[PDB]
Amino acid sequence: DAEVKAAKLFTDAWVTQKTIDEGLSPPNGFTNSSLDSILTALKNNNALG
Amino acid sequence: LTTEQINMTKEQKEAQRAQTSDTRTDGTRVAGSVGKQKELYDQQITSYKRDAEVKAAKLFTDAWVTQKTIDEGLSPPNGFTNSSLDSILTALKNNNALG
Amino acid sequence: LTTEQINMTKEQKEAQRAQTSDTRTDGTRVAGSVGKQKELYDQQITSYKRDAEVKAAKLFTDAWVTQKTIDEGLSPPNGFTNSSLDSILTALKNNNALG
Amino acid sequence: DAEVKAAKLFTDAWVTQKTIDEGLSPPNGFTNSSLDSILTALKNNNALG
Amino acid sequence: QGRKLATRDIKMTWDNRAGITHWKYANRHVTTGAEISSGILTSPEYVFTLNDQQNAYNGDTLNMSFSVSEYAADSGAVGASSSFVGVVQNGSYMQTPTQLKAAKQLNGDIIFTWVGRPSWQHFWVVNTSVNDSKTVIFSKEWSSESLTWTVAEQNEFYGLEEGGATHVIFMVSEYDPSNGLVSIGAQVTGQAEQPSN
């Protein structure tokens, strides 16, 4: 939880930067592959949602 | 009365044995009251882990939602298609006795 | 008095026995007070699991709703059709005694 | 937690400044590299999200 | 022999005497002797996924201590065990492709393009089905940086006759013809890119 709070603090500012100026390259952590891996982990751990 | 207290002391001894070892003297599992407490503790540990994962998952999902809102045409991450969602709702319907 | 205390000590014995083991001496199940507590523990475990599933299910459904809002004409995942919703509503009406 | 509160106190004001006036230089903490490190740390610690 | 796959998993291979069908294994922590997992497996290979690495260690590792022994099903019997404690075959000296893209075409073909080092023009490509995510078709090496996958989707794989597959899962990595070592690689997943006009 201590880590997650600061992580959210950073991500909100990145979202503000993106919505102000389009065309920003994603930090490679928001690409489709990482999101797909995270979703597969969620589906597998919680017994298919 | 002394014979009856002889019989009771063994039960006290086993009930207090259950606090260190899983097996109960002769070699049977502890199965009453204490077993349910241990099961609750295991379930609490798993729930802790699941909530910890879900927080970061939401942290990523919100950013992707904002990205989709700003620019249309972004490809779903392959987990947002119809098939995975259909499986998810099927599981939710089955587990909770038809919703 | 000694005879009646002899009678009471057996009940204390079985009350202490009820913790570690399920069966009660002669071979009958524990059925009062303790049994309800064990049933509550089981129900709490199941509710933990159900809430853990529901959180991730909501996480996915929000993204699907955003996708539908941005681009119309998306085929529903077959879990949001009229038949499944009708079954869910009938289940809600039946379980809660007609709402 | 005590540190995070004041950090948020500063971050919100910077976000408002960015919203009002575009073109402000990010403090190098909101670039892509640091955010990528933060996201890979989150992914690693929580067993792939 | 330890092998770190492109997907960052670790796999080991065992010679088979053909007289026994089951084996037993034990996997341990590195810094301490704590046992991560154990059991009996009916196949001569074991894959230690990156999720398990992240569960045990805070990050993916290049170190392992493994012990395996052959086991008999009819009577509980455990023979001598072979232990491996060194680093895996690694393969990190080669770099990885930087940017990868998959674009749909009006013809229906899908074009995969990636940027690689001029010195290293040997690559290994892996493709997987979107339905099962394990079918692992279309696995070979290509020296060309750009790949045209044509219309194999419509034929013999998907029942679709003309629609094709919109979603793709592609993964390319540098390959060594002599050793066979493979770099980490990069992946694409999603709807690919719909064509303009």
3-state secondary structure B67-80: HHHHCCCCCCCCCC
Of the residues A3, A30, A36, A40, the best mutation for testing chain E's interface (the one with the most E CB atoms within 10 Å of its CB) is: A36
What is the bridge-based pairing of β-strands C28-29 and E22-28?
unpaired
Residue E1, classed as helix, strand or coil, is coil
* Neighboring chain D residues of B77 at a CB cutoff of 8 Å: none
Separation between Cα atoms, residue E13 and residue E179, nearest integer Å: 16
CA distance B77 to chain E (A): 5
Resolution for the entry shown, Å = 3.2
Residue in chain E closest to D47 (alpha carbons) equals E54
Separation between Cα atoms, residue D47 and residue E8, nearest integer Å: 14
Question: Within 10 Å of residue E98's Cβ, how many Cβ atoms?
Answer: 10
Residue C63, classed as helix, strand or coil, is helix
Separation between Cα atoms, residue E24 and residue E40, nearest integer Å: 5
Separation between Cα atoms, residue E146 and residue A48, nearest integer Å: 37
CA distance C57 to chain A (A): 6
Separation between Cα atoms, residue C1 and residue A26, nearest integer Å: 84
Residues 6+ apart with CB under 8 A from E165: E130, E153, E158
> Which CA distances in Å does E152 have to C84, E7, E110, E131, E157?
37, 24, 10, 16, 7
Query: Which residues of A touch chain B, with CB atoms under 8 Å apart?
Result: 1, 4, 7-8, 11, 14-15, 18-19, 22, 26, 29-30, 32, 34-36, 38-43, 45-49
> Which CA distances in Å does B82 have to B36, B46, C8, E98, E159?
40, 29, 66, 31, 18
Least Cα distance to A45 among E26, B89, E55 occurs for: E55
Residue-wise DSSP of E73-115? TTTTEEEEEEEE-SB-----SS-----EEEEE-TTS-EEEEE-
* Neighboring chain D residues of E51 at a CB cutoff of 8 Å: 47-48
C-beta separation of E127 from E137 below 8 A = yes
Separation between Cα atoms, residue C11 and residue A1, nearest integer Å: 49
Chain E touches chain C, with at least 3 Cβ pairs below 8 Å, answer no
Residues 6+ apart with CB under 8 A from C11: none
Residue-wise DSSP of B38-54? HHHHHHHHHHHHHHHHH
Quick one: E43 exposed, middle or buried, by C-beta within 10 A (0-12, 13-18, 19+)?
exposed
A residues 14..33 contacting E (CB < 8 A): 32-33
Question: Within 10 Å of residue B91's Cβ, how many Cβ atoms?
Answer: 18
Least Cα distance to B81 among D9, D32, C77, E28 occurs for: C77
Could A2 and D7 be called an inter-chain contact, meaning their C-beta atoms sit closer than 8 Å?
no
Alpha helices in chain A (DSSP H): 2-20, 32-45
CA distance E61 to chain D (A): 12
Residue in chain C closest to B59 (alpha carbons) equals C59
Residue in chain E closest to A28 (alpha carbons) equals E99
Q: What angle do CA D29, D31, D34 make, to 5 degrees?
A: 65
Separation between Cα atoms, residue E82 and residue E84, nearest integer Å: 7
* Neighboring chain A residues of C58 at a CB cutoff of 8 Å: none
E7, β-bridge pairs: none
Could A46 and C60 be called an inter-chain contact, meaning their C-beta atoms sit closer than 8 Å?
no
| Per-position b or e across E122-154, b if 16+ CB within 10 A of its CB | ebbbbbbbbeeeeeeeeeeeeeeeebebeebbb
C67: tokens are 């996708």
Question: Within 10 Å of residue E155's Cβ, how many Cβ atoms?
Answer: 10
E87, β-bridge pairs: E63
Separation between Cα atoms, residue B18 and residue B30, nearest integer Å: 7
Separation between Cα atoms, residue B99 and residue B95, nearest integer Å: 8
Separation between Cα atoms, residue E72 and residue E63, nearest integer Å: 30
Could B77 and E190 be called an inter-chain contact, meaning their C-beta atoms sit closer than 8 Å?
yes
Residue in chain B closest to E130 (alpha carbons) equals B78
Contacts by E7-10, CB closer than 8 A, 24 or more apart: E7/E50, E7/E171, E7/E185, E8/E50, E8/E53, E8/E60, E8/E184, E9/E47, E9/E48, E9/E49, E9/E50, E10/E47, E10/E48, E10/E53, E10/E64, E10/E88
